């Protein structure tokens, strides 16, 4: 319970599975440099929920960008360097609080999300 996602949950009220066209779907962080803005989404084990983790961190830190696994969908920004994002790591709820999902400006809004 010492490890968590930096971002809030994305509850899925609809029946349609979550999807994102290329580029969109990456929450924005002012602390993050344009190189660091690269990671994945993991479906919450136990409605389904999705958590964003940076590349090389989180429950699937060992997966390289582009792997196929059910529950894992990959997103990345432009100019994002392919490195382990160890300098961001994950979130400790004891020392830091969860950050509201920071969607980019005028992004896609699939069914069920307002």
């Amino acid at each position, epitope marked *: 319970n010492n490890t968590a996602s930096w971002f809030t949950a994305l509850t899925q009220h609809g029946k349609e599975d979550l999807k994102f066209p290329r580029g969109q779907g990456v929450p924005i962080n002012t602390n993050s440099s344009p190189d660091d803005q690269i990671g994945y989404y993991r479906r919450a084990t136990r409605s389904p929920r999705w958590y964003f983790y940076y590349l090389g961190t989180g429950p699937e830190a060992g997966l390289p960008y*582009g*792997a*196929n696994k059910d529950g894992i969908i990959w997103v990345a*920004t432009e*100019g994002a360097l*392919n490195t382990p994002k160890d300098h961001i790591g994950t979130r400790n709820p004891a020392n830091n609080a969860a950050i509201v999902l920071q969607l980019p400006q005028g992004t896609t809004l699939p069914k069920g999300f307002y």
Partner: T-cell receptor, first 110, second 109 residues
């Protein structure tokens, strides 16, 4: 648009070698591959090369007699196939690609 | 590894058909780098699909890609006689290589 020219047709005898070229009309971090196709048969991938790095990966079926090399200064890449035999009669292609691997991203939509 | 493809494919022109491309867990169902190529008889291969679904610019939306399990499927819609050519699938491997399919030749009635 970037197009590729090669070395002309060749007619060699078994036991000798062959060195084909592949010139591009970007030779930075470019995955250059050579593919084969026996007449009436399917495609068969053979090798890869990143020129500025020099690391070349080969398919295990061809690992041992084919060799891929790059000339980054001239923007040309060579391929050296030795120990030629009858079953190696086929049409040989070259192609330029891109691979992310451990480099920086570009919205170039590579 | 090995990539299994249907040898031949055909249908009434103007219609659509799904062409399969099967492999193992570490070449098609492990990575998202499945590709598709067209090769006219006598002409060099040409690209229509680079990522599993992504289509390069200058290619009509009549071509679209998809993947299920370890079996990707190419779906040509509104097939014309101008598409008469070979169709091959390729994908990245955990061995950091490329593997092609056995080949699917086409014919329009």
């Amino acid at each position: 648009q970037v197009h590729l020219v090669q070395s002309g047709a060749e007619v060699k005898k078994p036991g000798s070698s062959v060195k084909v070229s592949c010139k591009a009309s970007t030779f930075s971090s470019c995955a250059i591959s050579w593919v084969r196709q026996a007449p009436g048969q399917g495609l068969e991938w053979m090798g890869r090369i990143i020129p500025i790095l020099g690391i070349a990966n080969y398919a295990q079926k061809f690992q041992g007699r084919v060799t891929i090399t790059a000339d980054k200064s001239t923007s040309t890449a060579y391929m050296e196939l030795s120990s030629l035999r009858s079953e190696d009669t086929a049409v040989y292609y070259c192609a330029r690609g891109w691979e992310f691997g451990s480099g920086s991203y570009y919205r170039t939509d590579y | 590894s090995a990539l299994t493809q249907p040898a031949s494919v055909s249908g009434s022109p103007g219609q659509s058909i799904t062409i399969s491309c099967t492999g193992t867990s570490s070449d098609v169902g492990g990575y998202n780098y499945v590709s598709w190529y067209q090769q006219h008889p006598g002409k060099a291969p040409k690209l229509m699909i680079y990522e599993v679904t992504n289509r390069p610019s200058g290619v009509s939306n009549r071509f679209s890609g998809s993947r299920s399990g370890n079996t990707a499927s190419l779906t040509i819609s509104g097939l014309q006689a101008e598409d008469e050519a070979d169709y091959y699938c390729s994908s990245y491997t955990s061995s950091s290589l490329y593997v092609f399919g056995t080949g699917t030749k086409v014919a329009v009635l």
